[PDB]
């Protein structure tokens, strides 16, 4: 079970890392500050 | 060639509708520009008031 | 000292809020035109 | 075995082909409220229209306003007493109309709200004018997002739909076409249009709905038609959480077979927004791109098509998929950014042109899909 | 007789060959504001143009006066009315 659970994310990590890298916030959403930086506050974002 | 009386009258009515719609659009655009302006001015007023109130409260606590 | 740095930081956040308001006004005007 | 799962190919549109589209919008459509706690919300049409204005799609599409449908035009389907009561009723005098409301199935699950006749007439006029412009051949696509309410019966208003403008649009298309194929995507079964066109050959009321414990309670694989309309009622009941890939693998074979055998001249494609993830009542898990792949496939043939709105109990996702479909209708792909509008703060915390699927139990086993495809092909070869 | 429509008054004026300009539509009437005077229709329908239009009230009053002034005789019209009723199908 552990092996299959880890494989189900290892098989698509190749495209997930590309999706995370290519992510770009729209210029006019940060003004509304709905983009909660709590993940950014704790470093939980996967960017970089 | 468009010289028909009834067709010309209907064309005039349609052009009147078009011109009233263009007038109403301009009036509404100006009104809601004014609404955005007054909202923005009120936002600045509230921001400055809260800034000054926070400064005064900090001075009082200190 | 502490008062000066507090005033500077509060002024910085106030300036950021004012810039955000100006940006929102600019976006609203662009929406108006479009 | 007929169903065959395939990977989801990227969106591709022919650049050589040119398509004329006449978007229909009545600015007063989004101003009637069903009630405080009612899932139905007509605001979505206005938000979607604002999105299409902001995306710059107006430079490549035609848009007009459809004149409201007259009472006699609206009576082409419904009974005289039904329309008479619907006009005469107001939220303030139902005490003297209690018996009529009880008879007409209105008030309890579908309540009376001011402007009801105005909304019904707007939707009917949109559908009728779209069909009329389709007949004249000026525009290949007649988008009428306002209407699409296909749950209205001949003498009863069930499922939050008081008037069924799809029937009137199909009628005005049939006045100059022998066979028009109707496609449903709403999760609920299209009970109204199905019952209206259950005993005729001149239409192909194809559907893609879900069978279970619901309000319609229809849409079985057994129902195929009566009289000359036998085997002319294609139903594809499904189950919880059908994803994008399997929905595409179900849709594309069936539509290809219908176009190869039925050979219609016009398509009345329903585009209900309640078949998406995060819906209020819809149990499906289809994403927006999956919701638009069906429309792109229908458009790829190159025949006149009348796109209509319909259900959709959420606002942001429905508006996003509607504007994406409108953009795809122009052979133009819309970027993921949702440019600022008066109703920008509605569009969730992501603020991207996308609706994302949730994790739901995909009860749609491949065996069920194979069985339903085999049944549909067997009942379709008779055409 | 202002309760009638524009089509009735226009056809009345055409039939009786009255020399009264066509009435301005209600929307056309409301068009004429300060900024509404800069549109094409108002700038081309106010001064120096033979296509000038006038309000609906005055045309309605003129038509009412002409209709009450126009006397009738039953022998001339009742048979004509019956013939028109029995002819409308053709
Ligand atoms: Zn539905």
From Swiss-Prot, chain A:
Disulfide bonds: none annotated. It comes from the Eukaryota. It is found in: Nucleus. Component of the RPD3C(L) complex composed of at least ASH1, CTI6, DEP1, PHO23, RPD3, RXT2, RXT3, SAP30, SDS3, SIN3, UME1 and UME6. Component of the RPD3C(S) complex composed of at least EAF3, RCO1, RPD3, SIN3, and UME1. Interacts with ESS1 and STB1. Catalytic component of the RPD3 histone deacetylase complexes RPD3C(L) and RPD3C(S) responsible for the deacetylation of lysine residues on the N-terminal part of the core histones (H2A, H2B, H3 and H4). Histone deacetylation gives a tag for epigenetic repression and plays an important role in transcriptional regulation, cell cycle progression and developmental events. SIN3 also has a RPD3 independent function required for normal longevity. Present with 1660 molecules/cell in log phase SD medium. This is Transcriptional regulatory protein SIN3. It comes from Saccharomyces cerevisiae (strain ATCC 204508 / S288c) (Baker's yeast). The gene is SIN3.
From Swiss-Prot, chain B:
Residues 6-62 form a coiled coil. It comes from the Eukaryota. It is found in: Nucleus. Component of the RPD3C(L) complex composed of at least ASH1, CTI6, DEP1, PHO23, RPD3, RXT2, RXT3, SAP30, SDS3, SIN3, UME1 and UME6. Component of the RPD3C(L) histone deacetylase complex (HDAC) responsible for the deacetylation of lysine residues on the N-terminal part of the core histones (H2A, H2B, H3 and H4). Histone deacetylation gives a tag for epigenetic repression and plays an important role in transcriptional regulation, cell cycle progression and developmental events. SDS3 is required for the HDAC activity of the complex and for the RPD3-SIN3 association. Belongs to the SDS3 family. Present with 105 molecules/cell in log phase SD medium. This is Transcriptional regulatory protein SDS3. It comes from Saccharomyces cerevisiae (strain ATCC 204508 / S288c) (Baker's yeast).
From Swiss-Prot, chain D:
Gene3D superfamilies: Histone deacetylase domain. GO terms for cellular component: cytoplasm; histone deacetylase complex; nuclear periphery; nucleus; Rpd3L complex; Rpd3L-Expanded complex; Rpd3S complex; Sin3-type complex. It is found in: Cytoplasm; Nucleus. Residues 19-331 are annotated as: Histone deacetylase. Disruption phenotype: Heterochromatin spreading downstream of the silent mating-type locus HMR. Disulfide bonds: none annotated. One of its GO terms (molecular function) is transcription corepressor activity. Keywords: Chromatin regulator, Cytoplasm, Hydrolase, Nucleus, Phosphoprotein, Repressor, Transcription, Transcription regulation. InterPro entries: HDAC_PDAC, His_deacetylse, His_deacetylse_1, His_deacetylse_dom, His_deacetylse_dom_sf, Ureohydrolase_dom_sf. The active site is at 151. GO terms for biological process: cellular response to heat; cellular response to nitrogen starvation; G1/S transition of mitotic cell cycle; G2/M transition of mitotic cell cycle; heterochromatin formation; meiotic cell cycle; negative regulation of rDNA heterochromatin formation; negative regulation of reciprocal meiotic recombination. The keyword Cytoplasm applies. Changing residue 150 to A: Impairs histone deacetylase activity and transcription repression. Changing residue 335 to A: Strongly reduces HDAC activity. Changing residue 328 to A: Strongly reduces HDAC activity. The keyword tRNA processing does not apply. A motif (ESA1-RPD3 motif) lies at residues 320-340. The ESA1-RPD3 (ER) motif is common to ESA1 and RPD3 and is required for ESA1 histone acetyl-transferase (HAT) activity and RPD3 histone deacetylase (HDAC) activity. Belongs to the histone deacetylase family. HD type 1 subfamily. This is Histone deacetylase RPD3. The gene is RPD3.
Curated annotation (Swiss-Prot), chain E:
GO terms for molecular function: transcription coregulator activity; transcription corepressor activity. It comes from the Eukaryota. Component of the RPD3C(L) histone deacetylase complex (HDAC) responsible for the deacetylation of lysine residues on the N-terminal part of the core histones (H2A, H2B, H3 and H4). Histone deacetylation gives a tag for epigenetic repression and plays an important role in transcriptional regulation, cell cycle progression and developmental events. The chain holds residues 104 to 193 of 201 of the full protein. Present with 704 molecules/cell in log phase SD medium. Keywords: Chromatin regulator, Nucleus, Repressor, Transcription, Transcription regulation. This is Transcriptional regulatory protein SAP30. GO terms for biological process: cellular response to heat; negative regulation of rDNA heterochromatin formation; negative regulation of silent mating-type cassette heterochromatin formation; negative regulation of transcription by RNA polymerase I; nucleosome assembly; positive regulation of invasive growth in response to glucose limitation; positive regulation of transcription by RNA polymerase II; regulation of DNA-templated transcription. It is found in: Nucleus. The keyword Nucleus applies. Belongs to the SAP30 family. Component of the RPD3C(L) complex composed of at least ASH1, CTI6, DEP1, PHO23, RPD3, RXT2, RXT3, SAP30, SDS3, SIN3, UME1 and UME6. One of its GO terms (cellular component) is Rpd3L complex. The gene is SAP30. The keyword Repeat does not apply.
């Amino acid at each position: 079970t552990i092996y299959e659970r880890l494989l189900e994310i290892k098989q698509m990590n190749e495209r997930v890392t590309k999706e995370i890298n290519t992510r770009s916030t729209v210029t006019f959403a940060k003004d509304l500050d709905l983009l909660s930086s709590q993940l950014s506050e704790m470093g939980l974002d996967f960017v970089g | 060639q468009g010289d028909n009386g009834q067709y010309a009258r209907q064309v005039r009515d349609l052009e009147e509708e078009r011109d009233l719609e263009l007038v109403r659009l301009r009036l509404f655009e100006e009104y809601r520009v004014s609404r955005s302006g007054i909202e923005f001015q009120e936002d600045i007023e509230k921001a400055k008031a809260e800034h000054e109130k926070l400064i005064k409260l900090c001075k009082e606590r200190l | 000292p502490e008062l000066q740095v507090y005033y500077s930081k509060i002024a910085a956040i106030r300036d950021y809020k004012l810039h955000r308001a100006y940006q929102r006004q600019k976006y609203e005007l662009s929406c108006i035109n479009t | 075995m007929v169903y065959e799962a395939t990977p989801f190919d990227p969106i591709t549109v022919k650049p050589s082909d040119k398509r004329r589209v006449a978007y229909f919008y009545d600015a007063d459509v989004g101003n009637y409220a069903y009630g405080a706690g009612h899932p139905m919300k007509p605001h979505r049409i206005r938000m979607a229209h604002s999105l299409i204005m902001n995306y710059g799609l107006y430079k490549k599409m035609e848009i007009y306003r459809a004149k409201p449908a007259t009472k006699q035009e609206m009576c082409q389907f419904h009974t005289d007493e039904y329309i008479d009561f619907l006009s005469r009723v107001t939220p303030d005098n139902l005490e003297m109309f209690k018996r009529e409301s009880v008879k007409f199935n209105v008030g309890d699950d579908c309540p009376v709200f001011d402007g009801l006749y105005e909304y019904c007439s707007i939707s009917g006029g949109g559908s009728m004018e779209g069909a009329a412009r389709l007949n004249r051949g000026k525009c290949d696509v007649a988008v009428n997002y306002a209407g699409g309410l296909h749950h209205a019966k001949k003498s009863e208003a069930s499922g939050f739909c008081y008037l069924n403008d799809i029937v009137l649009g199909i009628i005005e298309l049939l006045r100059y076409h022998p066979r028009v194929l109707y496609i449903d995507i709403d999760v609920h079964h299209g009970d109204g249009v199905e019952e209206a066109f259950y005993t005729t050959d001149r239409v192909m009321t194809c559907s893609f709905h879900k069978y279970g414990e619901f309000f319609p309670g229809t849409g079985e694989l057994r129902d195929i038609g009566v009289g000359a309309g036998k085997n002319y009622a294609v139903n594809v009941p499904l189950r919880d959480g059908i994803d994008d890939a399997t929905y595409r693998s179900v849709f594309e074979p069936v539509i290809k077979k219908i176009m190869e055998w039925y050979q219609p001249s016009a398509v009345v494609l329903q585009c209900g927004g309640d078949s998406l993830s995060g819906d209020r009542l819809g149990c499906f898990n289809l994403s927006m791109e999956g919701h638009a792949n069906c429309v792109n496939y229908v458009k790829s043939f190159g025949i006149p098509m009348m796109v209509v709105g319909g259900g959709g109990y959420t606002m942001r996702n429905v508006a996003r998929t509607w504007c994406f479909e409108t953009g795809l209708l122009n052979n133009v792909v819309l970027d993921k950014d949702l440019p600022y509008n008066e109703y920008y703060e509605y569009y969730g915390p992501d603020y991207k042109l996308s609706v994302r699927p949730s994790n739901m139990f995909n009860v749609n086993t491949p065996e069920y899909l194979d069985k339903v495809m085999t049944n549909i092909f067997a009942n379709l070869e008779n055409t | 007789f202002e309760e009638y429509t524009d089509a009735f008054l226009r056809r009345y004026k055409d039939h009786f060959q009255l020399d009264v300009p066509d009435n301005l539509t209600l929307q056309g009437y409301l068009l004429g504001s300060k900024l509404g005077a800069k549109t094409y229709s108002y700038k081309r329908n106010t001064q120096g143009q033979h296509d000038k239009r006038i309000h609906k009230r005055d045309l309605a009053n003129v038509v009412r006066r002409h209709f009450d002034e126009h006397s009738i005789k039953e022998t001339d019209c009742i048979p004509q009315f019956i013939y028109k009723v029995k002819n409308q199908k053709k």
